[PDB]
Design a protein around this ligand. Structure first.
Ligand SMILES: CC(=O)N[C@@H]1[C@@H](O[C@@H]2O[C@@H](C)[C@@H](O)[C@@H](O)[C@@H]2O)[C@H](O[C@@H]2O[C@H](CO)[C@H](O)[C@H](O[C@H]3O[C@H](CO)[C@H](O)[C@H](O)[C@H]3NC(C)=O)[C@H]2O[C@@H]2O[C@@H](C)[C@@H](O)[C@@H](O)[C@@H]2O)[C@@H](CO)O[C@@H]1O
Ligand SMILES: C[C@@H]1O[C@@H](O)[C@@H](O)[C@H](O)[C@@H]1O
Ligand SMILES: [Ca+2]
Ligand SMILES: [Ca+2]
Ligand SMILES: [Ca+2]
Ligand SMILES: [Ca+2]
Ligand SMILES: [Ca+2]
Ligand SMILES: [Ca+2]
Ligand SMILES: [Ca+2]
Ligand SMILES: [Ca+2]
Ligand SMILES: [Ca+2]
Ligand SMILES: [Ca+2]
Lengths: 103, 103, 103, 103, 103
């Protein structure tokens, strides 16, 4: 089991760490069919998504996808500093796998 | 996959963008049968609904309808600035599809 | 579809609007068997319940009842001004059908 | 249907009302197997539990047990004054049945 | 039934109490397949996880795992002082079984 986001991210293929050390600039959420997703942006122009749930996700990830969207909404509203994000760079916008928060 | 709300909204028929750049003036919700819905207003007189779930919605959308109501309530209570709404304009009140917040 | 709480309330028999324009003075909740309910009061001595969920409530109302209790708790805790309540007046205490908040 | 916590509490055997009129001093929560519970304390030394779900609880109480633990956590973190608790006094620690908040 | 976290922790093998008396330094969460987990750290260097749900967890522990992650996230975001953690010391990082908060 990994002890931090960087080591967790290294267990997966096609992932990358982005270091933001910044609060979320914008939070977007959609209930429209086939686009049930969240998008966040940062000041520096980075855009990330939480993926629409789909056949590519195992059952155990479903509750974790809904948790991530909850986390990003409350992070946004509290102006919490996002340290790092682990993302899948094979999606556009890049797709969030993990988040760390520190300040 | 769209990268912002405007591009998302363009994926659907019968939608338009509003750019409020304002907090929600009023928040209403109902638990009455066949009217389990939220209504929000803005200082400028605009009125929007989150629709009663129904045939127009597929199964993946039910969780997102609930999340949208959660998002609107906490945005109201935090006085969070709404940047844009994507809404369906063949409903009265216009029906929310997506929201962006930025300040 | 109604555009406000007052028009929504009028669609039901045995309802009326209370206009409080005040924060919730007390919040009570119960997990006791057959009394899984909430009760709120206002400084003017008005008392209202969220009903125990039952057979008089269709499935779509079950989620909405739980949301409403969530709403009242967080409204209480943030001292949010309640504008109006739509309530069934054929229950004692009068039972909440809808709420609007504005300040 | 009762209109306050004291009358609700008096509908049950083996209960009494504690009047705290004080914030929660400590909040404890456990996920350990067979001890999935919460424990709160007050400055006066009083200690109360939300019980582990089990056969003494009817199906309608399961969501309300979860709601209560959510309520105690947010009350703790907001320093919300707890007015009264209705508790079962045949459990050790005494087990919460209902809570009222007012300040 | 135990009345405090120390006595609760003593009911289990492979556990120990850490007395932190400190807010959470970082919060990390992951939706990644098979690492649906949370990691917290403290200023003193200590690292703890909430375990990926698994065969070592009975079905009653599943809601509580979800709650604990909710609790850690809101604690981090309110800078809530964590008094004690009961952790399993046969996992790496040590895995949270219980938390107490007081300040
Ligand atoms: C609003 C807009 O147009 N924004 C773009 C940025 O793209 C957005 O954000 C990124 C993270 C992706 O989610 C995009 O889909 C999204 O539109 C854009 O960021 C770059 O996007 C690239 C992917 O299209 C790529 O991720 C790039 O970073 C990687 O590639 C560059 C090549 O120059 C470098 O090798 C980086 O080291 C590498 N990073 C890795 C592998 O972790 C993104 O660029 C980086 O992130 C930006 C936010 C910014 O900090 C850049 O300086 C940095 O290189 C940027 C590109 O400038 O333009 C718009 O802001
Ligand atoms: C009201 C009481 O408070 C503490 O003193 C506990 O030890 C008792 O069991 C009871 O829960
Ligand atoms: Ca600010
Ligand atoms: Ca801080
Ligand atoms: Ca204001
Ligand atoms: Ca702000
Ligand atoms: Ca006040
Ligand atoms: Ca206000
Ligand atoms: Ca204080
Ligand atoms: Ca107050
Ligand atoms: Ca601080
Ligand atoms: Ca405090």
């Amino acid at each position: 089991t990994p002890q931090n986001i960087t080591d967790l991210c290294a267990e997966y293929h096609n992932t990358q760490i982005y270091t933001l050390n910044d609060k979320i600039f914008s939070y977007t959420e959609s209930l429209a069919g086939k686009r049930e997703m969240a998008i966040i942006t940062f000041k520096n122009g980075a855009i990330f998504q939480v993926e629409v749930p789909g056949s590519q996700h195992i059952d155990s990830q479903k509750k974790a996808i809904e948790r991530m969207k909850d986390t990003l909404r409350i992070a946004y509203l509290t102006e919490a500093k996002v340290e790092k994000l682990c993302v899948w760079n094979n999606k556009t916008p890049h797709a969030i796998a993990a988040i760390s928060m520190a300040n």
